Amino acid sequence: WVSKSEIKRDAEELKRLGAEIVDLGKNALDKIPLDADLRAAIELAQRIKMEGRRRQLQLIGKMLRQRDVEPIRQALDKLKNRHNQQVVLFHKLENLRDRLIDQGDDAIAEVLNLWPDADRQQLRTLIRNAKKEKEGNKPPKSARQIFQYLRELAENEG
Amino acid sequence: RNGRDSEAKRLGVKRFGGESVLAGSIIVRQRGTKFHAGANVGCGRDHTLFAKADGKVKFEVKGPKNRKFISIEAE
RNA sequence: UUUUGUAUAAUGGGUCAGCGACUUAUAUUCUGUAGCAAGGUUAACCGAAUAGGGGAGCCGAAGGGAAACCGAGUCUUAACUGGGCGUUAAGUUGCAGGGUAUAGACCCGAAACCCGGUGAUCUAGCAGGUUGAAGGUUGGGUAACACUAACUGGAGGACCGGGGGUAGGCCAAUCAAACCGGGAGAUAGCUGGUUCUCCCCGAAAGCUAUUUAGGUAGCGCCUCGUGAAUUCAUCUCCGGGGGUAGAGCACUGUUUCGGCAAGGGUACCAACCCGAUGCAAACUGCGAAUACCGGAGAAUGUUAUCACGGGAGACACACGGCGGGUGCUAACGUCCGUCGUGAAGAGGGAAACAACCCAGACCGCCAGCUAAGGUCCCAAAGUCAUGGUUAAGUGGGAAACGAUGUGGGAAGGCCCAGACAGCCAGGAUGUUGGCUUAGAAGCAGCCAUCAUUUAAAGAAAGCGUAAUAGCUCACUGGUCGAGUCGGCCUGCGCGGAAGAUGUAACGGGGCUAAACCAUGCACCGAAGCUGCGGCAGCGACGCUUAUGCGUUGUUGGGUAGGGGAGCGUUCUGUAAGCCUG
RNA sequence: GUCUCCACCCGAGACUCAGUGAAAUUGAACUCGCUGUGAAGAUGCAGUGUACCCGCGGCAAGACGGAAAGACCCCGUGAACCUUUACUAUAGCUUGACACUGAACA
RNA sequence: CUUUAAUGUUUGAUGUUCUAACGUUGACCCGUAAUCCGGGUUGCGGACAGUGUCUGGUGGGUAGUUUGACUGGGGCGGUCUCCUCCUAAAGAGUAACGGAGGAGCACGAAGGUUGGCUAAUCCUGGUCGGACAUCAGGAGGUUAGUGCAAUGGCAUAAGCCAGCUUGACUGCGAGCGUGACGGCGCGAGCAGGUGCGAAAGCAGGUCAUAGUGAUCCGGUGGUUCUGAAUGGAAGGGCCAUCGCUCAACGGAUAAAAGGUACUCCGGGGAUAACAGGCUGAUACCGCCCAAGAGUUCAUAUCGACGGCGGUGUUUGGCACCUCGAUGUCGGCUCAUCACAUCCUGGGGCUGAAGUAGGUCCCAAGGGUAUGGCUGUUCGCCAUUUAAAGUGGUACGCGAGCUG
RNA sequence: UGCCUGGCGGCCGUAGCGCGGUGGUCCCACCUGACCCCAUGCCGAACUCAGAAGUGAAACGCCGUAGCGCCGAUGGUAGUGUGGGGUCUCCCCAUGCGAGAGUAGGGAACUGCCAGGCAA
Fold first, then answer.
1. Is the C-beta atom of B31 closer than 7 angstroms to strand E?
2. What's the Å distance between residue A15 CA and nucleotide C361 C1'?
3. Would strands B20-21 and B55-62 be described as parallel, antiparallel, or unpaired?
4. Which of A122, A131, A127 is nearest to A152 (CA)?
5. Which of residues 33-72 of B have CB within 7 Å of strand F?
6. CA distances from A141 to A120, A137, A155 (A)
7. Is the CB of B10 under 7 A from strand E?
8. Is A143 within 7 A of strand D by CB distance?
9. DSSP line for A40-56
10. How far, in Å, CA of A50 to CA of A47, rounded?
11. Hey, which residues does B71 pair with through a beta bridge?
């Protein structure tokens, strides 16, 4: 006995994977081990639009029903992991910059702890300049400089 | 769990005896072969009985197993 | 008004006078009517102009195919005996009307969205503390700075108990967002209303689908118009086929009896099976009654039948009966196939009660007949008759049970060789028993359940004694004696049948027959029928041929809905006419 | 009854918008009590009983009393609210290229 | 031209210096007794920062939306397409959150023709082998098998064996059944050419009934069909095929998750939180059977197992009127009424020598407390008396009062 | 015209099965060989090729056997359409139809055409 609800959920997952691989770019498709027929179908789906695109995606899912998906899932998982790592690094940099702009010495302490080589005097000067810019509605030049400095520190650490 | 009912296949006798029918008409719609074909009567792939000529329908018992056969008389 | 179903204690309205609810524009489809007629027709514009000019333009007279292309024929095919679509009917302009789509679109009743402002003299806001960098101060440092250890001011906008600014909190004391002018009279599968009259016809709450269940499109059904055949319906005859009731186990299952009894662990469980027993909506070697349609037939039914076009409504049905699914064979629970009722019909009777019984209203008459139901009165008729039943208010509630309440049916035994019961008498003695000896001796029990006198007495049935004892009864003599006992069918009754606003489970009076069983006579008893008169739709025959009918028969309950026919008022020409101080 | 341990009165704080000569209310009333039924609990239905007509002061068994198109609950391919790793997009963010943006040099 | 390079040209990148653009909320002077702004000089960085377009994700901080339908209150559970049997009441068809189930395959053969053949249910004999492996005979005649789960029928076998083949072909197809329709199924026969067969004949798929997805749109091949001045090309149309768990399967978007008891609007007794009546599985009271207990003895008292009367006081079903409103459970006063009587009076029975009593009939005229425990209806404990009885009346009365 | 035989049809269990008798005169079978036509998932087992030596074992045709299966009345009964009634989850009344099984009875099939031996 196989539950039709489980079958429908599996079909939805397969269609989601098909849509994700279709959205993936040329480099991602090349990296992912896709057979010739599946690759041609994906390219045709990308070329077409409207309800035709969704029905081609449904065809892709139907093919995936029989074709193995574990290598495709692994490739998608690793690509998404890399992308999420990059996005998390960017979010951490933005949050650190925001904390530096808001609090001050409290965020400077965390910056120094994360990167001992960071210059306390330079960070304090940049934070003061950012506060002055906020007060005088000046462009966030200090904020951009702080972001660049944090990016350089992260690159040096890595 | 139960309750799934299929729509009826419209089974039964469509043309009865003593009535004039045209060629190609369907006499009986049956799954099996309750009634067999006789003179001027044909049986399709799906056990569909049809008349090969215009006439009146008739029923007759024949065969070692006493099976009912349908025939057409040119009346 | 919503609900199938309303005064119901489901909605609503105080009255009066006035105001008010499908109009109008743009295109399309159809009906009536007028001209022209293979033509009709104008628009803008000109126009001393509602005339005339203006044929620009629009529609059919020939279409097929997507098109090329072909043509009274064309389209897929090499093309069909082919099949799809054309000719053998004539289109147009106006008017009036029935619908469709867009504009407010029959009208009223929302929240809410966007645009520009009135915004703060009420209120939320400079209340207050805190988070808190900014300034200063003191303190280490430094020539002096930065930084840091503590104090102060408080940014910030907030944290805390008018599309914004600042506890449905506030910005007119119901503002996580008011009002004004506009989109916008926004939209609403929703509530409510939709105003004069007459006549004819007059259904449904059903099937298919729905991001779809109270709604909608098609079908089902209703109305109006056109055309068409014993067209259709009841019934008689003829042709069929079911697997339903019934019956049954040929086959598939199911419970048991006795077995053959594999297998299982031989006093013990048991498969495939045998004959019977019942049962099966998911079994039919058999198989109905009904019903289905097809061919013929006299009769009747205003063609009650079918196809097309315009217009609808409806698309929540409930009760009863019939055979059922589910619920506990319980419903006024729910779902199925069919008829009736109501929805769409009041009537008379059941006291009142939609679904219970009789019965389909054209109107009028101070006439009679009649259906169901009644005839003692309320309240109209029998205080009716014939042969019976009831002693209990049974009738006028209720069931298993028990029964000398009562009248019969089949009968059994005993019966003047005097039946049962009465009136006078016996029921003596071992049987103080071996047995549990405690005394049970028959009267609680293992126990024989015997044995002389016998018209007659048991080794024992009750009352009665610690057991004895004593009084009755099994049976027996004297007198009378004729009927006596138990069970069933039993119809009518008895207790089971006791509850709360005040009798109340016959309507009451009140009935011992004025209650029940079967029959008759007649009577009462409806808007049913007939007797007379009057109005209207309908097919015809005899005129009239547009309207009167000599007339015949027939119909006239009606929601929604459809069709037909009319009245009231304002204004315009009729109307510089008519009435009118 | 000093006071506790609080509770009750005689007079104030704390807070508390009846007022016109009105009011909710009205389909119309010659507006009785019980029994049975009734879209199910009867002033109005069938049966039965009571009661001279109308005022004045009290009681409150009823007229499903009035004050809120439920303050209970649900429905709406209705609205609004907020939440997001629900869909579609945006403010801001950062990557590099293109002109503002150069001149000498290795 | 791959592999080479002094020499003449081009920009790209790294690194150093300068500033002439740029920034200067750096200073000084002037309009200006002017903290704004503008005109000039200078220092500091300087082609950097930023500026406008594109390019990447982050993105509810922000804007527009969504989260289907059915259900014994609701939530929750479960279903959304096709087919077989009964429900489904003997034409046909027929629903329910009914009872049993299967399917979204597969076969180039398991299809066609032609020519032939026919199992079990059991016994008999035989090495493994015995109830059942295979062999020979016998009652046997489809109950075997008929690819699937099932229905029918299949002996003329539609079941099994064997030579050859792709008619599972091409354009149709009068007519018939079905459905509102789309559409689906059958279908004699016409034109071409094929497979089997000497032929009458069959082959337009599987012995039939489930194996399915219409429309719009995309790829593939053709079609000069058209091809917007000409000739082309491009683009559009026609045919055949490949494309959807579009499983919400007649298929509203290619694209959507929670609640708001902070809520508003319109509606709902189609539908609830409470109330009458219709209902009666269950529960309560009484009784028959009542084995037997009660020294013994069925009824002084119980009385196993079943059975029968009254109650609706809880669990059981419609809401038939109540969302244009029925404010629920406690308490205070008023309670009338039925006796199935707490005692109070008249009484019968015994295991009633008397108080005491246990049981049962009539009797409603009389009354039937106070404190701890809970807001509670209800329920337990203590002290007196004759007792501190039960019920319904909207689980009474907030139009009598108290939250 | 009859006893019979082979083939083709109707009815197709009253028609079919168990028992005894009868037949090789026509027709039917077994049988010799199959090396040659053909055939076995091995085999002349089956089919087939030239014969008929011999017989009727078995089959096949006819008669009797009612023994079985089967058909089959009449009546009754269950049931059922119509209207009504009752102590209405059931039954009865008037009416129309009407069962199944069993029962009387039947039953060893009958019938049309063509071709052949015998007697006519």
1. yes
2. 73
3. antiparallel
4. A122
5. 60-64, 66
6. 19, 11, 21
7. yes
8. yes
9. HHHHHHHH--HHHHHHH
10. 11
11. B58
